[PDB]
Amino acid sequence: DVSTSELDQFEFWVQYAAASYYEADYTAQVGDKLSCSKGNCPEVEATGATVSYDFSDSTITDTAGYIAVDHTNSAVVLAFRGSYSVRNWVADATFVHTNPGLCDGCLAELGFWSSWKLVRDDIIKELKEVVAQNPNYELVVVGHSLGAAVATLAATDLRGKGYPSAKLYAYASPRVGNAALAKYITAQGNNFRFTHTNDPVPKLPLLSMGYVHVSPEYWITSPNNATVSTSDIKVIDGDVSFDGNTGTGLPLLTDFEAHIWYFVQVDAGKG
């Protein structure tokens, strides 16, 4: 578608892423290882790875994471985571752118870147160381989300630085840146891324614113828891618017858951 391986790786890575877231791982320580717891992662744981380182987141920142390583594979790783818261861121946141640197244109976213840167440196340183240680390883880166874105850126840165490769992964893532850155890264490669378915874261831121893323893517588818495968895844490549895631548519937351787942758951750781 793828392969397985790749797936495985992717698954593984894522786881780582888852782881891262946791815291534991881152924281842881170083080484340680890673782981986771718941488971897722496982694988890673296984491987083981550880850581190383880481870172955381716291216050310142957131872121966281870581690184680781692984070984097984190887690787290283880184992762891342871122923131958581896422848812717130897617728802518310713112873115721115820145640138870173890396490359251109590239630138881227710122926150893432820132975271890464711160851381880176440380890481880178650580890585380187670780790587260184380881070486081979690778690285890877891673993451997842935111972471993845951161892771991616870281890776790228790383690659550049050194690384490259690294890887890445892423896962888812857313875117870152632118394209360129894416491219660168892618290229680088590795890467992976893733895414788942738807997710837312891845877617863113856216493319438219510117831114873118890276590639490639992966895516896954498946658913948540578931597982895955391969087938478922796817791848794518690238971114665119339509395719894957872115395519578916825117873113838513318711758717856221797827997010976391891726594969596995892652876151758981815491878431």
From Swiss-Prot:
Keywords: Disulfide bond, Glycoprotein, Hydrolase, Lipid degradation, Lipid metabolism, Secreted, Signal, Zymogen. This is Secreted mono- and diacylglycerol lipase A. The active site is at S145, D199, H259. GO terms for cellular component: extracellular region. InterPro entries: AB_hydrolase_fold (IPR029058), AB_hydrolase_lip/est (IPR051299), Fungal_lipase-type (IPR002921), Mono/diacylglycerol_lipase_N (IPR005592). Both Fe(3+) and Hg(2+) inhibit the activity significantly. It catalyses: a monoacylglycerol + H2O = glycerol + a fatty acid + H(+); a diacylglycerol + H2O = a monoacylglycerol + a fatty acid + H(+). SUPFAM superfamilies: alpha/beta-Hydrolases (SSF53474). Belongs to the AB hydrolase superfamily. Lipase family. Class 3 subfamily. It is found in: Secreted. Pfam families: Lipase3_N (PF03893), Lipase_3 (PF01764). It comes from Penicillium camembertii. Transmembrane segments: none annotated. Multiple forms of this lipase are due to the presence of different carbohydrates, which may contribute to the stability of this lipase but not to the enzyme activity. Its EC number is 3.1.1.-. GO terms for molecular function: diacylglycerol lipase activity; monoacylglycerol lipase activity. Secreted lipase strictly specific to mono- and diacylglycerol, but not triacylglycerol. Hydrolyzes long-chain monoacylglycerols most efficiently with the highest activities observed on 1- and 3- monopalmitoyl-sn-glycerol or 1-monostearoyl-rac-glycerol. Prefers to attack alpha positions to beta positions of monoacylglycerol, but shows no stereospecificity on mono- and diacylglycerol. Glycans are attached at N225. Gene3D superfamilies: alpha/beta hydrolase. Its main location: secreted. GO terms for biological process: antibiotic biosynthetic process; lipid catabolic process; monocarboxylic acid biosynthetic process. Coiled coil: none annotated. PROSITE patterns: LIPASE_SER.
